[PDB]
């Protein structure tokens with residue numbers, strides 16, 4: 376176990392068939408979680424569970440380019456629960472990131488940042504106890 380925020384290096388960036396697995400537990404009064412796949416200061420892929428946006432739960436995904444956020448992609452399917460252990464898996468494919476939570480498909484996010492081999496850090500933050508962050512090739 377690790378204390379957030381945590382940065383996982385992705386040396387040489389990401390590549391298709393890379394599977395990133397984040398294990399932890401959602402804190403009991405959680406408000407937000409964020410994963411940030413970074414290319415320098417740019418955020419290629421921001422994955423942001425919000426537990427109380429206008430008294431709703433929503434997943435917001437986006438990209439930050441030149442310090443500006445782009446167009447949000449939102450999902451109301453919300454597989455997280457306060458207080459519960461989770462597993463987020465991010466599978467890099469040629470054209471998108473695919474996200475599964477607790478072994479159930481959640482969403483896909485098309486690559487806006489094209490230079491996968493420059494997406495060299497994953498930031499993990501928010502209202503979690505982080506157990507582990509690792510990757511393998513499938």
Ligand SMILES: CO[C@@H]1[C@@H](n2cc(-c3ccc(Cl)c(F)c3F)nn2)[C@@H](O)[C@@H](CO)O[C@@H]1Cc1cn(C2(C)COC2)nn1
Nearest residue numbers: 407408409421423435436437438444445446447500501502
């Ligand atoms: C309030 O800032 C969030 C921003 N954010 C979250 C965190 C964050 C920080 C720490 C933790 Cl621990 C954590 F879990 C976080 F999520 N940091 N930045 C992102 O989520 C962005 C995703 O579009 O939306 C907000 C900013 C925003 C949105 N938009 C629009 C595109 C314009 O109309 C919608 N303009 N600016």
